[PDB]
């Protein structure tokens, strides 16, 4: 039993000042689909574009100085490109693994909720068929014995009580129907993001290797187009840095205080106390369902005792009736078994473990991958800047 | 949803590789960590690695003597191969480190659940004992002028004895927890040292290559001679790394083919075979053998409550000062009752099976991939350093 605590790379990154456009201070509270927050992240993109423009201004200054008015730099550029590619590959793998763990946890939670709902529905149907079995049995088998009719009626009322107790439990249709869509969407987005960064890595490596191989054939016509591509790769790297910074700050925002956001998001389809119980599990919050399970088991035991007593006192009288009554016993047995499974799902240990696993997949692997991808972008930008600086010196 | 473990391609293919003793003998063994024959069979991979190292060195020295006794492209190729090798090795080391952490997490979770089960059983037994002593103290307070109350107390004592026996029917998890925690500590220690050693190897390779390049830029000083000398040292280190990676991958891949069989064979005395088969395999149609216990246990509790309920409805005018501890009885039962729910949550298979499917994904999906990528490291680093050593003495 452990509780999530935000690591250093989350709290420190959350400490980064948040600004809008006109030197305005905004609230560093996660709020997707907004305007004072969604546009707040665009400041990072503005800073990235400013840095890209400044870098190209300095490169143009160098070109003007070297036009109007060596192998060590190429070696440095190649080494920096290789280091950047390695760091980027590691970061991409880590941030893909984080989302894979997220999807796994969401699938597990969806399966548990579906199992709970199916068990409740099956128990309700079982009681509904118990009703008609009682009706058929008391139709004409028991006439003179008033006590037998009385105990059949008492069993029928107990069945009604069990039905009401089962209906007392919540319904998990909305949570499942949103978890499935969130899982599908995150898988889709993760696939495209991974493919895009893989293509970027391949393109960078190919360009650098072609540069190294073709610099030996004494500056053919490919050099000009290659140098032109050296600017599109730079703008791609800067855009990657902007995207990584925005995603990292968003994840830090929805990792500093995740339970507040989760509780605020869901307050209608399921109760607030249920959510607080599932998100916070300890031997102080006992259960909101303790009374319901207790009375369900009490009614089941009363039913079983009455059925046993009826069997012990009806073997000689109406021997052909047991064919129905024994079935009831089996039915109750099944119900009893289901109850155990139910108390294994209503316990919050499994769901809290799934929530902790999803949160670890978000805040411990996605953010590290984004940070390493930002380091990749910085190193690749530096290496390509060095390559473009050393290019025209040949001609 | 719920899934069953299936061996991936990199395990089924890696398991197929021949295992031949040390003298081309059919060792035909499945898995045996403590058996000397299996260790000798695994030593065949080390023998092959040493043979490969010797062949590579003899080929390199034959080439050297032929080209001596009778170009920056080679240096560039060596540097590029070294950088690619270092990157692949870092990724593989991180990946194989990220599996021995999930292993420890799963072991700790299972240990915590077993400890909770044992503590709950012990606490319930103690609660029944204090219930018995409370009945013993109370029986002297009320008198037998009513008669039925003494019979009710006798029935409560009998039910308490039945509850105690039912609790004693449940298994004990001391040996399992001790083995689990010792294995967790050992694997943490081993993986920490492995990671530290390989990180030091990466740093050494990078430093050697960079300072060798700088010395080459320094017109072949004695430093260059020192680097050509230690090229053989780092080559044999890389070959030993390949030996270790191949041996470990061959070793912990046969376990991944049938892990449940090995686990069940390891533990068959301290706990029953049915319990282990239930926890390892609980797919669709198992009865959860504890059920027949829990059910009757629950029954007894309810009976007790009903009795004490009556004892609170027909004893209000007969010595009300005696009702105080009676309310305590109810509280006692209440506590026991809620504990029972927790118990039926821990005895459920899916609580621990998901821990068995995580300690298995941390071995069969992350350790083996890391070992394979580290073997790729060893191959690439050996090739790069062989090229560097071949191109070295050309300057002299
Ligand atoms: C997440 O939970 C949702 C339910 O909230 C799942 O969606 C649907 O779940 C039902 C219930 O099992 C599936 O019905 C099944 O259809 C098969 C078709 O052959 C039938 O054989 C079964 O007896 C059952 O009736 C339904 O197919 C499923 N919908 C989809 C699109 O799969 C969902 O599967 C759960 N998992 C995920 C990853 O969303
Ligand atoms: C696996 O579970 C077992 C049982 O829960 C753990 O063993 C218990 O661990 C606790 C703390 O780790 C021990 O408490 C300590 O006791 C010493 C005195 O012996 C005291 O000086 C400390 O301040 C602390 O209270 C407890 O004694 C120990 N029980 C036994 C029977 O060894 C075990 O630590 C768990 N494994 C892991 C890796 O956590
Ligand atoms: C052991 O558990 C039982 C039930 O789980 C406790 O009985 C419940 O105790 C509460 C609070 O002590 C009482 O609620 C009362 O309900 C009546 C209606 O029956 C209402 O008029 C009162 O204003 C009050 O809310 C009541 O005794 C009982 N309630 C229910 C629904 O069962 C018992 O108290 C527990 N033992 C101890 C020592 O607390
Ligand atoms: Ca990882
Ligand atoms: Ca990984």
Residue numbers in the entry:
A (entry chain B): 5 to 73, 89 to 414
B (entry chain A): 4 to 73, 89 to 414
Original paper wording:
Tweety homologs (TTYHs) are conserved transmembrane proteins present in all eukaryotes including three members (TTYH1, TTYH2, and TTYH3) in humans. TTYHs have been reported to form Ca2+- and cell volume-regulated anion channels structurally distinct from any characterized protein family with potential roles in cell adhesion, migration, and developmental signaling. Each protomer consists of five transmembrane helices (TM1–5) and an extracellular domain (ED) which extends 75 Å from the membrane surface between an extracellular N-terminus and intracellular C-terminus.
Full-length Mus musculus TTYH2 was expressed in HEK293T cells with a cleavable C-terminal fusion to EGFP, extracted and purified in detergent, and reconstituted into lipid nanodiscs formed by the scaffold protein MSP1E3D1 and lipids in the presence of 1 mM Ca2+. We determined the cryo-EM structure of TTYH2 in the presence of Ca2+ to 3.3 Å resolution. In the presence of calcium, TTYH2 adopts a side-by-side homodimer (a “cis-dimer”) within a single nanodisc membrane. In TTYH2 cis-dimers, we observe horseshoe-shaped density within the pocket, although the density is not sufficiently featured at this resolution to unambiguously identify and model.
